[PDB]
């Protein structure tokens, strides 16, 4: 169920319909570079670093191959397979040219496809109202790619795709799976499933353009070839925070650390330009790089947009629990975990997943079955921010198998 | 699984956290209107039509109730339940105020939620960098709602929701179903399923804000109460274009009308500010009203954005077919239909569905089974536009049960 335009799931060349054999070619040229075949004037000399050429198409050559990354606003970022730089409109010496530059992004890297008919289109830069074509209509000559306004004299700007590459290492997306309740404990010695062992539900997954994935091992020129999209998974599991055998009437104290640490948020921001907002464990904040794709990322990952100006942090609660049963009882206490995992197209993990422990959704397993522990008291030891300072109303009975979610009736501000 | 913020699936009041009993109130006042409780100066006199009041909240009064419609860019359009008008920033007499106006839309109708903590937020107008609050911090007085820049001694702009309405007539969305192949024919008398009888697959469905649904029966003040969202369904079915018994070696001619009528496109544009682009039967063109929601509409309806400057039209093909079997054979010919249906929250249909017949995807049923008809020749009789003038390469064998899709190998321009 992949809802992308065909230009976004392949590489393609770009050519004037009036050119026999030439296509748009990525150059590493400098100002003063001579286009030998061109008539004299503005079409003969490069005015900018990394102009595009009207080159005889070489089959299999990455310098002619482009992928169109689809923005939420229906425009495209157009990246080349040779080095992963993107097309950009630029004025140098009063001449409108197409260059290749690193993804910024900026409005001059956004292109509009204007389809004239089934196989013919124009590449529109909407900010300048210009269309990409060959300098002075020299359609069969070595010269630069320009971007010009429509006038009577203007070179025809009708383009086509000359060649396609359809084998591009698209990822295989995992199937959605529901979050199951944890099994019952089987004996006193059963501590339940540890976080490493707990099954993950796949709640959502989205493609991420490789352009702003700071993969610590793959540089951009290799990402665009091997993993033009990455996969971000939204997973959930039941995370055990502690387990112990209690004697009849035994009282114990635990330090419960929930949320997500500052170092994990900084790693997530560096890697994909996204953080978890303080307003919830499924609430995403977007930076400048990820913002143009935010609605697709939210829709496909089954998260929500964050409205917070602060990131989710850690909180340490001191919890006092009392075994109010006259039996020896195994207690195992779990909170819901949100796990964000990034993989390459080959399925390889890019680093350690980012995990938010949600203190507001909690479950209990006991042996024997159907035992209940008393939550005597909760106190905040410390928190990284003041966004969520609610605590459980105590005393509270936690029963085997019963999920408790925070609401107006079972919680209060810490100072009441 | 509805992926919307909680503010988008309920109505809520808006209040200063520093007000005992007052909330934002929709007024139908004129310039010169006197706020009796206000101290003298800019807070006492209305400067614009339809200012907002700081009114003692009346429970169940629609003049205090707002729904937040979520834009693709993570901002909101805020509509009131009394008349369906939306909040807007306005400068009149050098004073920044909040007014209510008809959905346009414009950038001054876009509000950003800035969540400070769990139950406190600010309403940000990002173009002007202003925040909504009560004039001169008169939090317990009858006066107007202003929108001011943050300065030392600016009125505190921390807000809350005082009251909620959660029973709002949200639609119950249909389940997605797959498109099944048509059954085999059972005898010579079996003409197969007519278009009225063919089962529909539900390929996608999306919520549409009532603000730009030109319901022919329900005015805006009634839509916002009864159907704050409408449902747009993307359905598919197999549409029978003809069926006949052929004698051995019999030749016949059919006029096949495909695409969508201009009158149906105009009706769709008037109703929801969307048309089907000429680049495909699932390709949507958005006007000024629907554009701010386009990525949500595409993602949820499982359609694609159109790149065409032309709407899908009708085309009439003359097809010559030949029964190349030495048997009497029942032939039934089908094309794929795309059916777009709009319903209110109560499930009632707003108009006749909009149907695109796709000439490029075709199936055949025969009796007896496993028979093949010859497509001798295809000619275009007329078309509404020149966007797609491809025809089948003939002769072409159409086989019982075999779906044929247009590609580069089996089609050509009509003039070749």
Author numbering:
A (entry chain A), B (entry chain B): 49 to 464
Which of the paper's sentences describe this entry?
The Cry48Aa/Tpp49Aa pair is produced by a number of L. sphaericus strains and is composed of Cry48Aa, a 135-kDa protein belonging to the 3-domain family of Crystal (Cry) proteins, and Tpp49Aa, a 53 kDa protein belonging to the family of Toxin_10 pesticidal proteins (Tpp). Mosquito toxicity bioassays have revealed that both components in combination are required for activity against Culex quinquefasciatus larvae. Within each Tpp49Aa1 monomer, two distinct domains exist: an N-terminal lectin-like head domain covering residues 49–214 and a C-terminal putative pore-forming domain (PFD) covering residues 215–464. The final model of Tpp49Aa1 revealed the presence of a homodimer forming an “X” structure with a large intermolecular interface, similar to that described for natural heterodimeric crystals of Tpp1Aa2/Tpp2Aa2.
To do so, pH 11 buffer was injected into the vacuum chamber of the SPB/SFX beamline, allowing mixing with the natural Tpp49Aa1 crystals prior to data collection. In total, 707,992 diffraction patterns were collected from which 426,506 could be indexed in space group P212121, (a ~ 80.12; b ~ 83.22; c ~ 156.49 Å; α = β = γ = 90, highlighting an increase in unit-cell dimensions in comparison to the pH 7 dataset). Manual building and refinement from the ensembled diffraction data led to a model with Rwork/Rfree of 0.177/0.199 at 1.75 Å resolution. The pH 7 and pH 11 structures align closely, displaying an all-atom RMSD of 0.487 Å. As in the Tpp1Aa2/Tpp2Aa2 structure, an increase in pH from 7 to 11 is estimated to alter the net charge of Tpp49Aa1 from −6.518 to −47.822 e, suggesting that alkalinity will destabilize the crystal by negative electrostatic repulsion. Overall, the binding energy of all eight crystal contacts (excluding the dimer interface) increases by 1.8 kcal mol−1, indicating a weaker affinity. Despite this, the binding energy of the dimer interface decreases (pH 7 = −11.1, pH 11 = −11.9 kcal mol−1), indicating an increase in affinity. This may suggest that, during dissolution, contacts between individual dimers dissociate prior to the dimers themselves. The most notable changes include loss of hydrogen bonds Asn51[ND2]-Asn350[OD1] and Asn51[ND2]-Asp347[O] of both monomers at the dimer interface. Given the proximity of these interactions to the cleavage site (Phe48) of the N-terminal propeptide, we hypothesize that loss of these hydrogen bonds would increase accessibility of the propeptide to proteases.
